[PDB]
């Protein structure tokens, strides 16, 4: 009865496509669900050298890889969580949940 | 024994134990985020893995 959605996705508005369907898709059965909590973003920072060998002006890469985390708590019996989360997915979002 | 002598070197640590998981050379290795990947092959598959130049 105390359930917790783990929304971890790489693309930004791909995570919007799921975190819109976890309110608009859930309120149709009348459950007072919690709101999507903005967890802070994580920029995985890599600076490699552009050059394969070691000749040229020291020109560095800056390969940022942003990750975006949300959580939505659920006032739900977990039978209904197997219904909503098994429907309407895209590969961008990894669909995970903390149970109790 | 030759079995005793042919692989007598510990590979518990050092920069000759781990290698590039594409090249199998022991240089420019990204140990960060468990990549085990040489800086050139990382640069090749950066777009493919998920990394991208923005800054």
């Amino acid at each position: 009865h105390r359930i917790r959605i783990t929304l971890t996705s790489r693309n930004v508005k791909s995570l919007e496509k799921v975190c819109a369907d976890l309110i608009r898709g859930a309120k149709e059965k009348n459950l007072k669900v919690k709101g999507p909590v903005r967890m802070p973003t994580k920029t995985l920072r890599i600076t490699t050298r552009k050059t394969p060998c070691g000749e040229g002006s020291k020109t560095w890469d800056r390969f940022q890889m942003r990750i975006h985390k949300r959580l939505i708590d659920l006032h739900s019996p977990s039978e209904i969580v197997k219904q909503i989360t098994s429907i309407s997915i895209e590969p961008g979002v990894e669909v995970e949940v903390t149970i109790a | 024994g030759h079995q005793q002598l042919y692989w007598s070197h510990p590979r518990k640590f050092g920069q000759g134990s781990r290698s590039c998981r594409v090249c199998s050379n022991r240089h420019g290795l990204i140990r960060k985020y468990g990549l085990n990947m040489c800086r050139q092959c990382f640069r090749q598959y950066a777009k493919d893995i998920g990394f991208i130049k923005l800054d």
Binding site: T8, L44, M65, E94 | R21, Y33, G34, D48, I49
Partner: peptide, 19 residues
């Protein structure tokens, strides 16, 4: 997972599966 790898190793090590 039991050994329970992090979400900084999820998008990187499952990123290697795309490669």
């Amino acid at each position: 997972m039991a050994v329970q790898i992090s979400k900084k190793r999820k998008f990187v090590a499952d990123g290697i599966f795309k490669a």
